[PDB]
Short mmCIF file of C-alpha atoms and ligand atoms in Angstrom, two decimals:
data_model
loop_
_atom_site.label_atom_id
_atom_site.label_comp_id
_atom_site.label_asym_id
_atom_site.label_seq_id
_atom_site.Cartn_x
_atom_site.Cartn_y
_atom_site.Cartn_z
CA UNK V 1 -0.28 0.10 -0.16
CA UNK V 2 0.85 3.75 -0.11
CA UNK V 3 -0.78 7.01 0.95
CA UNK V 4 -0.01 10.60 -0.34
CA UNK V 5 -1.10 13.94 1.75
CA UNK V 6 -0.82 17.10 1.16
CA UNK V 7 0.64 19.43 3.98
CA UNK V 8 -0.10 23.16 4.31
CA UNK V 9 1.60 25.97 6.14
CA UNK V 10 -0.60 27.50 9.16
CA UNK V 11 0.44 31.11 8.41
CA UNK V 12 2.88 33.29 6.35
CA UNK V 13 5.61 32.31 7.73
CA UNK V 14 5.70 28.53 7.47
CA UNK V 15 5.58 28.45 11.21
CA UNK V 16 4.45 24.79 11.12
CA UNK V 17 2.54 22.35 8.62
CA UNK V 18 -0.93 20.64 8.98
CA UNK V 19 -2.13 17.38 7.01
CA UNK V 20 -5.57 16.03 6.95
CA UNK V 21 -5.81 12.94 8.72
CA UNK V 22 -9.15 10.65 8.87
CA UNK V 23 -9.86 9.22 12.22
CA UNK V 24 -12.66 7.16 13.04
CA UNK V 25 -15.94 5.49 11.25
CA UNK V 26 -17.54 7.54 9.75
CA UNK V 27 -14.08 9.82 9.35
CA UNK V 28 -13.24 12.63 11.65
CA UNK V 29 -10.86 14.63 9.61
CA UNK V 30 -8.65 16.60 11.86
CA UNK V 31 -5.56 18.72 10.62
CA UNK V 32 -2.30 17.54 12.10
CA UNK V 33 1.30 18.58 12.82
CA UNK V 34 3.30 15.78 11.52
CA UNK V 35 6.27 15.61 13.43
CA UNK V 36 9.63 13.74 12.88
CA UNK V 37 10.76 14.71 16.51
CA UNK V 38 8.12 13.00 18.23
CA UNK V 39 6.39 9.94 18.41
CA UNK V 40 2.99 10.46 19.65
CA UNK V 41 -0.18 10.91 17.74
CA UNK V 42 -2.84 13.42 20.11
CA UNK V 43 -5.87 15.24 19.34
CA UNK V 44 -7.97 17.59 20.82
CA UNK V 45 -10.96 15.69 21.38
CA UNK V 46 -14.35 16.06 23.10
CA UNK V 47 -12.30 15.13 26.37
CA UNK V 48 -10.52 18.31 26.17
CA UNK V 49 -10.96 20.83 29.04
CA UNK V 50 -13.33 23.15 27.38
CA UNK V 51 -11.48 26.59 28.28
CA UNK V 52 -8.70 25.01 26.49
CA UNK V 53 -10.12 24.56 23.13
CA UNK V 54 -10.35 27.48 20.97
CA UNK V 55 -11.46 26.74 17.25
CA UNK V 56 -9.69 23.28 16.78
CA UNK V 57 -11.45 20.53 15.27
CA UNK V 58 -12.10 18.15 17.83
CA UNK V 59 -12.31 13.96 17.79
CA UNK V 60 -15.18 12.56 19.54
CA UNK V 61 -14.53 9.03 20.12
CA UNK V 62 -17.92 8.60 21.00
CA UNK V 63 -19.47 9.00 17.65
CA UNK V 64 -16.67 6.64 16.09
CA UNK V 65 -18.45 3.13 15.73
CA UNK V 66 -14.48 1.69 15.55
CA UNK V 67 -13.43 3.62 18.45
CA UNK V 68 -12.05 1.54 21.73
CA UNK V 69 -10.79 2.81 25.10
CA UNK V 70 -7.41 1.43 25.45
CA UNK V 71 -7.95 0.90 29.02
CA UNK V 72 -5.80 2.49 31.68
CA UNK V 73 -3.65 3.82 29.11
CA UNK V 74 -2.22 7.61 29.80
CA UNK V 75 -0.25 9.80 27.83
CA UNK V 76 1.86 13.03 28.73
CA UNK V 77 4.20 14.84 26.76
CA UNK V 78 6.47 18.11 26.62
CA UNK V 79 8.21 19.92 23.53
CA UNK V 80 11.28 21.89 23.05
CA UNK V 81 9.34 25.14 23.22
CA UNK V 82 8.08 24.25 26.62
CA UNK V 83 4.46 23.51 25.64
CA UNK V 84 2.65 20.19 26.59
CA UNK V 85 -0.67 18.12 26.38
CA UNK V 86 -1.47 14.77 28.43
CA UNK V 87 -4.73 12.78 28.55
CA UNK V 88 -5.76 8.86 27.91
CA UNK V 89 -6.04 6.76 24.65
CA UNK V 90 -8.41 5.13 22.02
CA UNK V 91 -7.59 2.78 19.41
CA UNK V 92 -9.57 3.93 16.02
CA UNK V 93 -8.82 3.33 12.24
CA UNK V 94 -6.46 6.25 11.02
CA UNK V 95 -5.92 7.00 7.33
CA UNK V 96 -3.52 9.71 5.98
CA UNK V 97 -3.93 10.25 2.37
CA UNK V 98 -5.58 6.87 1.17
CA UNK V 99 -3.47 4.75 3.70
CA UNK V 100 -5.12 3.26 6.68
CA UNK V 101 -4.19 1.90 9.76
CA UNK V 102 -6.87 0.08 11.97
CA UNK V 103 -6.36 0.00 15.68
CA UNK V 104 -3.95 3.01 15.73
CA UNK V 105 -3.44 4.92 19.25
CA UNK V 106 -5.05 7.95 18.97
CA UNK V 107 -4.39 9.94 22.32
CA UNK V 108 -6.86 12.06 23.41
CA UNK V 109 -5.87 15.31 24.92
CA UNK V 110 -7.67 16.30 28.50
CA UNK V 111 -5.25 19.10 29.00
CA UNK V 112 -3.01 21.04 26.50
CA UNK V 113 -0.97 23.90 26.94
CA UNK V 114 -1.63 27.75 26.24
CA UNK V 115 0.27 27.37 23.09
CA UNK V 116 -1.78 24.69 21.49
CA UNK V 117 -4.90 26.46 22.34
CA UNK V 118 -3.84 29.43 20.87
CA UNK V 119 -2.93 27.76 17.27
CA UNK V 120 -6.47 27.39 16.09
CA UNK V 121 -5.05 25.68 13.05
CA UNK V 122 -3.66 22.69 14.41
CA UNK V 123 -5.97 20.04 15.81
CA UNK V 124 -3.21 17.71 17.13
CA UNK V 125 0.25 16.15 16.23
CA UNK V 126 0.82 12.90 14.69
CA UNK V 127 4.59 11.90 15.20
CA UNK V 128 6.77 10.07 12.88
CA UNK V 129 10.09 9.52 15.09
CA UNK V 130 10.58 6.15 16.50
CA UNK V 131 8.25 4.40 18.61
CA UNK V 132 10.80 4.12 21.58
CA UNK V 133 9.86 8.01 22.06
CA UNK V 134 6.11 7.13 22.48
CA UNK V 135 4.76 8.11 25.84
CA UNK V 136 1.85 6.03 26.37
CA UNK V 137 1.72 4.19 29.86
CA UNK V 138 1.90 1.67 30.93
CA UNK V 139 1.87 -0.18 27.34
CA UNK V 140 4.15 1.94 24.95
CA UNK V 141 2.24 2.67 21.51
CA UNK V 142 3.74 2.53 17.79
CA UNK V 143 3.54 5.33 15.55
CA UNK V 144 1.36 5.51 12.52
CA UNK V 145 4.55 4.84 10.63
CA UNK V 146 5.73 1.90 12.49
CA UNK V 147 1.95 0.58 12.26
CA UNK V 148 1.86 0.75 8.62
CA UNK V 149 5.23 -0.12 7.64
CA UNK V 150 4.70 -3.88 7.34
CA UNK V 151 2.22 -3.06 4.45
CA UNK V 152 3.91 -0.39 2.50
CA UNK V 153 5.26 -0.98 -0.47
CA UNK V 154 8.55 0.27 0.58
CA UNK V 155 9.08 0.97 4.46
CA UNK V 156 9.57 4.72 3.98
CA UNK V 157 7.69 8.03 4.15
CA UNK V 158 9.34 11.14 2.21
CA UNK V 159 8.67 15.31 3.37
CA UNK V 160 8.57 17.51 0.69
CA UNK V 161 7.70 20.96 2.32
CA UNK V 162 6.99 24.02 0.60
CA UNK V 163 8.27 27.46 0.93
CA UNK V 164 5.26 29.60 1.63
CA UNK V 165 3.17 26.97 -0.21
CA UNK V 166 1.76 23.43 0.05
CA UNK V 167 3.77 20.24 -0.32
CA UNK V 168 3.51 16.50 -0.02
CA UNK V 169 3.90 13.72 2.63
CA UNK V 170 3.87 10.20 1.21
CA UNK V 171 4.19 7.07 2.20
CA UNK V 172 5.53 3.64 1.17
CA UNK V 173 6.95 4.81 -2.07
CA UNK V 174 9.52 7.74 -3.50
CA UNK V 175 8.04 9.90 -5.99
CA UNK V 176 11.08 10.26 -8.69
CA UNK V 177 9.36 13.34 -10.35
CA UNK V 178 9.29 15.53 -6.94
CA UNK V 179 13.32 16.21 -6.87
CA UNK V 180 16.19 16.88 -9.15
CA UNK V 181 19.36 14.91 -9.24
CA UNK V 182 19.92 11.90 -6.84
CA UNK V 183 19.24 11.37 -3.42
CA UNK V 184 21.89 10.67 -1.11
CA UNK V 185 21.64 8.49 1.89
CA UNK V 186 23.15 8.97 5.06
CA UNK V 187 23.22 6.79 8.32
CA UNK V 188 20.88 7.42 10.97
CA UNK V 189 21.26 6.70 14.61
CA UNK V 190 18.18 5.46 16.76
CA UNK V 191 19.99 5.59 19.82
CA UNK V 192 18.01 8.90 20.95
CA UNK V 193 14.57 7.83 19.08
CA UNK V 194 15.05 10.55 16.36
CA UNK V 195 16.21 10.69 12.95
CA UNK V 196 19.56 11.50 13.86
CA UNK V 197 22.34 11.67 11.34
CA UNK V 198 25.53 13.30 10.92
CA UNK V 199 26.14 16.46 8.19
CA UNK V 200 29.28 16.99 6.68
CA UNK V 201 29.67 20.67 6.87
CA UNK V 202 28.23 23.72 5.83
CA UNK V 203 29.03 26.97 3.63
CA UNK V 204 27.45 30.55 4.07
CA UNK V 205 26.37 32.39 0.92
CA UNK V 206 28.82 32.01 -2.10
CA UNK V 207 31.87 31.03 0.54
CA UNK V 208 33.92 27.86 0.63
CA UNK V 209 32.27 24.75 1.93
CA UNK V 210 33.95 24.00 5.89
CA UNK V 211 33.83 20.12 6.22
CA UNK V 212 32.77 19.41 10.27
CA UNK V 213 30.61 16.58 11.29
CA UNK V 214 27.38 18.34 12.41
CA UNK V 215 25.18 15.76 14.26
CA UNK V 216 21.41 16.66 14.36
CA UNK V 217 18.14 15.31 14.03
CA UNK V 218 15.75 15.78 11.06
CA UNK V 219 12.38 17.30 12.61
CA UNK V 220 9.56 18.31 10.43
CA UNK V 221 7.66 19.67 13.70
CA UNK V 222 10.57 22.23 14.47
CA UNK V 223 9.89 25.58 12.65
CA UNK V 224 13.79 26.57 12.49
CA UNK V 225 17.38 25.20 11.75
CA UNK V 226 19.37 25.14 15.16
CA UNK V 227 23.16 24.62 14.76
CA UNK V 228 25.95 25.05 17.00
CA UNK V 229 26.97 28.81 17.90
CA UNK V 230 30.13 29.03 16.06
CA UNK V 231 27.95 28.08 12.68
CA UNK V 232 25.33 30.25 13.45
CA UNK V 233 27.70 33.30 14.20
CA UNK V 234 29.73 32.60 10.89
CA UNK V 235 26.29 32.93 9.18
CA UNK V 236 24.90 36.11 10.88
CA UNK V 237 28.34 37.92 10.58
CA UNK V 238 27.50 38.13 6.81
CA UNK V 239 24.40 40.19 7.55
CA UNK V 240 24.82 43.92 8.14
CA UNK V 241 23.28 44.84 11.48
CA UNK V 242 22.49 41.17 12.78
CA UNK V 243 22.84 40.23 16.33
CA UNK V 244 21.57 38.15 18.87
CA UNK V 245 19.26 39.73 21.12
CA UNK V 246 18.53 38.09 24.63
CA UNK V 247 15.12 40.23 24.94
CA UNK V 248 13.78 38.42 21.44
CA UNK V 249 15.53 35.08 22.32
CA UNK V 250 17.64 34.46 19.31
CA UNK V 251 19.41 36.22 16.21
CA UNK V 252 17.52 39.27 14.47
CA UNK V 253 18.63 40.96 11.63
CA UNK V 254 17.24 44.22 9.79
CA UNK V 255 14.15 43.74 7.75
CA UNK V 256 15.93 45.85 5.19
CA UNK V 257 18.35 42.86 4.65
CA UNK V 258 18.75 40.21 1.70
CA UNK V 259 20.18 37.26 3.36
CA UNK V 260 22.78 34.79 2.01
CA UNK V 261 22.02 31.03 1.43
CA UNK V 262 23.41 28.59 3.84
CA UNK V 263 24.17 25.24 2.41
CA UNK V 264 24.39 21.98 4.49
CA UNK V 265 26.20 18.55 3.55
CA UNK V 266 24.86 15.48 2.97
CA UNK V 267 27.75 12.94 2.69
CA UNK V 268 29.10 14.33 -0.56
CA UNK V 269 26.24 16.22 -1.66
CA UNK V 270 25.01 19.62 -0.72
CA UNK V 271 21.42 20.82 0.32
CA UNK V 272 21.21 24.83 -0.50
CA UNK V 273 18.72 26.86 1.40
CA UNK V 274 17.57 30.11 -0.01
CA UNK V 275 18.28 32.89 2.16
CA UNK V 276 14.75 33.91 1.88
CA UNK V 277 13.70 30.91 3.59
CA UNK V 278 15.80 32.06 6.97
CA UNK V 279 13.47 35.31 6.77
CA UNK V 280 10.77 34.95 9.45
CA UNK V 281 9.61 38.31 9.31
CA UNK V 282 9.19 41.25 11.56
CA UNK V 283 9.38 39.96 15.14
CA UNK V 284 6.31 42.16 16.32
CA UNK V 285 3.71 43.64 13.71
CA UNK V 286 5.53 47.04 12.37
CA UNK V 287 8.65 46.19 13.43
CA UNK V 288 11.97 46.59 11.27
CA UNK V 289 13.82 44.04 12.93
CA UNK V 290 13.25 40.60 11.48
CA UNK V 291 13.65 37.08 13.38
CA UNK V 292 16.47 34.76 11.71
CA UNK V 293 15.84 31.42 10.66
CA UNK V 294 19.12 30.10 11.62
CA UNK V 295 19.17 30.05 15.17
CA UNK V 296 21.89 28.68 18.12
CA UNK V 297 21.32 25.30 19.58
CA UNK V 298 23.65 26.15 22.26
CA UNK V 299 20.54 26.27 24.95
CA UNK V 300 18.66 23.13 23.77
CA UNK V 301 21.49 20.27 23.59
CA UNK V 302 21.04 19.08 19.99
CA UNK V 303 21.14 20.15 16.61
CA UNK V 304 17.50 20.25 14.61
CA UNK V 305 17.26 20.53 11.07
CA UNK V 306 14.03 21.70 11.20
CA UNK V 307 11.50 23.06 8.38
CA UNK V 308 13.86 26.23 7.30
CA UNK V 309 16.28 23.27 6.09
CA UNK V 310 13.88 20.44 5.39
CA UNK V 311 12.01 22.29 3.06
CA UNK V 312 14.74 22.97 1.07
CA UNK V 313 15.01 19.44 0.28
CA UNK V 314 13.03 16.34 -0.87
CA UNK V 315 13.67 14.31 2.22
CA UNK V 316 13.35 10.40 2.45
CA UNK V 317 13.00 8.90 5.92
CA UNK V 318 13.80 5.11 5.20
CA UNK V 319 12.31 3.04 8.03
CA UNK V 320 14.23 -0.26 6.52
CA UNK V 321 16.08 -2.56 9.18
CA UNK V 322 18.78 -0.19 9.18
CA UNK V 323 17.14 3.13 8.89
CA UNK V 324 18.51 6.07 6.82
CA UNK V 325 17.95 9.33 5.49
CA UNK V 326 18.03 10.53 2.31
CA UNK V 327 18.21 14.33 0.72
CA UNK V 328 17.67 15.43 -3.05
CA UNK V 329 17.57 19.15 -4.03
CA UNK V 330 14.38 20.13 -5.53
C1 IJ9 U 401 14.45 22.40 24.63
C2 IJ9 U 401 15.20 21.28 24.21
C3 IJ9 U 401 15.58 19.63 23.84
N1 IJ9 U 401 14.76 18.99 23.26
C4 IJ9 U 401 13.61 18.57 23.49
C5 IJ9 U 401 14.35 20.01 21.92
C6 IJ9 U 401 13.97 18.84 21.13
N2 IJ9 U 401 12.41 19.26 20.59
C7 IJ9 U 401 11.65 18.35 19.92
C8 IJ9 U 401 10.10 18.61 19.38
O1 IJ9 U 401 9.77 18.88 20.62
C9 IJ9 U 401 9.86 17.84 18.57
N3 IJ9 U 401 9.78 18.28 17.63
C10 IJ9 U 401 9.48 19.69 17.72
C11 IJ9 U 401 7.92 19.58 17.97
N4 IJ9 U 401 7.48 21.19 18.11
C12 IJ9 U 401 5.92 21.09 17.77
C13 IJ9 U 401 5.09 22.03 18.12
C14 IJ9 U 401 5.04 22.60 19.79
C15 IJ9 U 401 4.23 23.12 19.98
C16 IJ9 U 401 3.16 23.54 18.89
BR1 IJ9 U 401 1.93 25.14 19.72
C17 IJ9 U 401 2.95 22.98 17.81
C18 IJ9 U 401 4.06 22.16 17.53
N5 IJ9 U 401 5.66 19.72 17.30
O2 IJ9 U 401 7.21 19.38 17.12
C19 IJ9 U 401 10.18 19.93 18.58
C20 IJ9 U 401 12.68 17.08 19.32
S1 IJ9 U 401 14.05 17.32 20.25
#
């Protein structure tokens, strides 16, 4: 089997991408944030504390003929921004882009933190990291991909995120029309539960390439590109007036600037992030200070190839017995 679904930016900055997911019978369609950096499929629901729901579409398990309480199971998760959610668990039929998993754990939120409430466009998350990170207790649950894997034509999914435009998540096949050149595959470590790999270096703008190993994770659920402070400083040093602002929480730059590209290495191949992809616009409405799309990982303990990087590429998440990541230009 295969599936194919369109993913759409939630706003004009590409802060996140949402993909429609069918849950239950009859289908209840919720728009979920596919997150290769976590492993829980959780939704706003009829159980979510009413004051914490503000415009989201909710899953109502009592209206699904295929829903079953996963008795005694609970879940609780926090994300890198400090947001969190928790609740109980149903199993139900879940379909993405025509690909169906029966008995998928659907984690129903009883509580969500303020950043989730405030984002009316995100109805929940669909985790696509390794199932060893799933938070359901006492019986850990598998991701949608892990459950689908054995049925897929090939044990892969691909992320083809757009820049200020929709893109595609495919399951079970590689769309050879969706990229240019070849896909370069690179080894993955699953030891931390992430799609963790080692970039071979970077370049700023038209500069020469610096060969240096950069461990990090491919994370569709993170907006920005978080890299070591040395690399990030070398990038922003090329932008007049750019500086790290403790009050804003990262590098800002004059909105009057044109930004240089940023290249990262994948083996002997290179992915070039256009400068415009690094512009996240005014820090507040009307400001002439703009927020940078490349930020230091120093406070977080891990480098993160988030959407800024991934949307410059066609990315293969190969979940074969030895997992690998593939990157192609597009
Ligand atoms: C600090 C620190 C150390 N590490 C915990 C950093 C890491 N963080 C991760 C994620 O938590 C998983 N994917 C990202 C993600 N964030 C979301 C999200 C959050 C809020 C809202 Br509102 C909507 C979506 N979805 O995915 C970040 C992996 S490693």
